[PDB]
Amino acid sequence: ERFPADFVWGAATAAYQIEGAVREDGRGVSIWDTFSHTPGKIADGTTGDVACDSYHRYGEDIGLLNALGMNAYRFSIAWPRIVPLGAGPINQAGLDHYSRMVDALLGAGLQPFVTLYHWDLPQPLEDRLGWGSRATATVFAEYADIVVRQLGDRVTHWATLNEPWCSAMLGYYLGVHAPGHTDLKRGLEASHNLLLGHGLAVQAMRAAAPQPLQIGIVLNLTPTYPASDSPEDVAAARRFDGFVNRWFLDPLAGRGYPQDMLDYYGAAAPQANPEDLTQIAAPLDWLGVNYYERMRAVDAPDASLPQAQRLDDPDLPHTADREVYPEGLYDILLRLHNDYPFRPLYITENGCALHDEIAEDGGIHDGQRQAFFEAHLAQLQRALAAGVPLKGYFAWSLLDNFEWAMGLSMRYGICYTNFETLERRIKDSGYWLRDFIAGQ
Template structure:
């Protein structure tokens, strides 16, 4: 695909509203490297990645994209994309090595430099406080299944906010608490690698409690900034017209979507979810007043979208997407492939699903400012003989999803921005370096960054604020 062909990819022009946010996203452990430098403590991901057999290929985030030393180059790439914002996460163990106590000044200094560089290039920082790299000392004390971790998170959020809020307007507490709770504590395919279904339910609750406590603490210091949270949402449909299939869809929807949306946006857990989970864990971890703390008013909601789930009742426990086969209350549920084109992750490409999740939030939880805080695709990118990386499948993927986003806006949904995952190829969690999501190709042997065709195409989109 040539640049001319990229320009004429689709026939119908689409315009986005003035001031629409365009950005790219990243996460600290996936890109920073420098895991033992300048006082940074170990995280659960450092420990997990160094556990034999945990990560495909034995990969670790020890070096990753070396963003800690190459952040200026990466900010330059963002500026070349025409990004108005950059969504990145702070490494809790870099800022608070043991998860408590005074901030590590060297860690604060790194984020000071990064934020200043972004602002100098006219790119606004969008901070996520937690993208899964829990300090190992807190995990040793029990991790997210323990209530105390929520309070430690609030203390960390307040301390960091006091230092950086003068230059950062948008603050996201958590990224995808479902993944942190269930992939980390139920299926064990993510750090810390535990397979304890009851603990995963407590972890989910305490993650949300920490979210609410953190917003309270930050607002108490300075309420002038914008606060939100990011959840990964999926349309969940039954594969056929049967009561058992509809109940399977209901259970997965409760676990993946309503378990987080309802407490944070309605102040209560879904009654059917509590019934589903009763056989796994009681409700003793939910104390009086918790849901009121969790339901802090939000200035925005971040939505991460990648695919749709289609399910049916099965004959026994099934391997679910992301290998999350130990989900509580998901036994006897089978995830069904529809035979659609899929990314390298095996996720079926379904742009309509993005519209469905945005419209559902708008319809069922009330109009609110929404941002697509992650959307993107992994493909088997390779450097061509001309030194270029042609990725027409990624261009087509983003084009189709952007058009759905524009349709949502036309239909009255308050969608205000879109962050592509990811800026660069990076450490893709349990997949190591085997999956490439980046707009920018990374040669891991040399750390050379090469913008892909999708990066040049996105720069056209951001310049014209449309397709």
């Protein structure tokens, strides 16, 4: 029934998804400014130019967090605000903004869980191959150093990257996220350079820190299950599990890249010397899990790599964009706790998108999202029972926002955002979370 009295309860956002104010106060151009302004890349014609206006309105966001009774806020710092040219001088006005925001959070009793990199690569870097260039790793670590120097007196818990799989594979292989490239080799190169940047940044942060820090990385993980026990389907499940999960988990754990996936990728695989792998494995203080869905895999020998497709299950519920499978959160956590070295663990995202509307009464009756939280929280109790060292949970998202290639059309908030007026209102699932956390 009850979580630890010191458990972290929060909600999560990312800078480009919420801030707006894309040209204000020296901010540079990010890959997502370029990509969202390219016709056809975003489903609904929208951009992050305004989004939730949280650059100006983070006080309102704090108001929501307070009303929900949370004790933490997971948000990202926009590299474009800090180092507008990507490699170059700092923009002190960017640092001061986040300093005030940090102070406002602490004043409110909300612990800042800061993500350094949530996908907003400065475009000048991308002009020099972006994550396809080792140099971008080096300058990422420089950025991480500067931010920690200024804010590490107040912020203890930091994450280097969010969802490197997405940045590499959706940004550089599948083309659906910024910058929009479509080549496997560049995706895999990008994955390496992200991981290297991570590891360089960890070391840089520890040296720059004015106090000891709790440094992590945030990974999306997708528990994968073969649709049958055939050798074809099991192999398909392994390939998909390697493509999403083990590709990142293994090097981080100091186990190198998984050899099965190296063989599979062939000459598309990256150049990975021992020195880089050592740096990638820089010791972490925690690992963040972003959990949404499972993959029930059938072999798909004509599909692109990894040649594994989802077998739909019409007896499971679906949201606006995903299949719901709460058990997968228990499975993936039990696997981390027993099979990998990372500890403690945080759930740094979990949530769902629905076709939310304000009803005649003025509330948002998003029962399926309440049920989603209740079912996943129950699985976290099961994981805790099994000994998994879980220390906190962040709902994705605090508020509806710019959901990447889906635009503002795909609503993940526990709070509803009216994108015309910028008014926010707590959804019924948000009130549920409030009352559940208060009970805890």
